[PDB]
Design a protein around this ligand. Structure first.
Ligand SMILES: O=C(O)c1ccc(-c2c(F)cccc2F)cc1
Ligand SMILES: O=C(O)c1ccc(-c2c(F)cccc2F)cc1
Lengths: 111, 115, 115, 111
């Protein structure tokens, strides 16, 4: 697994489950191409987005649909989504996000 | 101001000075139109981006150029930038502070919204 | 001031108002002596804790009573409080801002230190 | 495992390895008793601190020796340590901390 995603809920102290995540790669023409997507699991994780063959060097955007997550909990959140944009330049990338209605934090663990 | 940005540096324990910030507003045709830009001051703050008249309802993107910040200090960071996307003024005018706390492989952002 | 505390609420997107804060200083005998206390204002800030004269070198503990904050709002949070422990003024006088961003099961803290 | 700890490094985007962690329980007399300790692994994790038998309801303090971690990297950090103080009131508790020289963040994931 070259790329994983993890999402936590800072209000409830739980994984953030069933959160939609879309990944994009920047194309030559400077636009974003759909690359991979999924929903976080019961553990707040999304594995199997890509393979090491397909995950070549490039600029990637990971978009986390935080607004839907909070709306489902009856909470009016601030952000439309959380985006994480980074260059992958070669082994394993974990993109983690910790969510609150008016705040989020993200870190990369690269091993 | 109705829109202020504040950026802090978690490595140095200081304001993040001279960080470029670009603000965009989503246009009728669903593209991001330039709205305002600036750089953070010696206090890590950026004021004067817009007026209450021009800051109408809409979806705004605040892009904080964190990579240029860390590279100007000679560090190779993870992220290209930090983006904060939000709907503004949809229940009348509010004042927004977007705060960001930066490290080379992590950032945090919060919003303080007052009426 | 040489010591200020600022607290924000990540659930409401607001300053965290009326948060109790107790500051202690490590004594010669290795126990925590009361140094100062107060509550955050409507802006989430707490000033006037100490003077540059009284804020000598030492190890300080800033305890932010986050549990009392969340319970006063009727939420059951995880932490008892948030503690920030640091050595101060060991290379001469500095001004310290301790900032905290609060959620029921998480908090973040940073320091801004200026000369 | 009723209690785990995890530590990440926000500067380098890596687990924080070989970080000393001490756990304490509040005794009747309102003092802190040593309860458990260890060093984080290569994955930045500390498992096997306690058993479900021994991890009864009570107030616990988890102290993370962040100052030594940064000092070993040639970095002068702000905090003496990071402390996480909480009541355990019954299944599984993960205490995570994300570290920078002048900042740290901590969350509890309770499942
Ligand atoms: O200067 C402020 O008002 C301020 C300082 C720091 C933070 C902050 C943050 F942006 C992320 C995480 C933790 C923080 F305290 C928020 C606001
Ligand atoms: O268990 C993890 O992988 C994990 C836990 C917590 C965090 C995190 C974060 F993404 C931002 C702020 C504080 C945290 F502990 C990151 C990763």
């Amino acid at each position: 697994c070259p790329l994983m995603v993890k999402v936590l809920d800072a209000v409830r102290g739980s994984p953030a489950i069933n959160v939609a995540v879309h990944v994009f790669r920047k194309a030559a023409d400077d636009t974003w191409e759909p690359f991979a997507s999924g929903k976080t699991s019961e553990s707040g994780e999304l594995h199997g987005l890509t393979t090491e063959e397909e995950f070549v060097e490039g600029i990637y955007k990971v978009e986390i649909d935080t607004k839907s997550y909070w709306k489902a909990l009856g909470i009016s959140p601030f952000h439309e989504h959380a985006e994480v944009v980074f260059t992958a330049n070669d082994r394993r990338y974990t993109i983690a996000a910790l969510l609150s209605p008016y705040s989020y934090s993200t870190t990369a663990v690269v091993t």
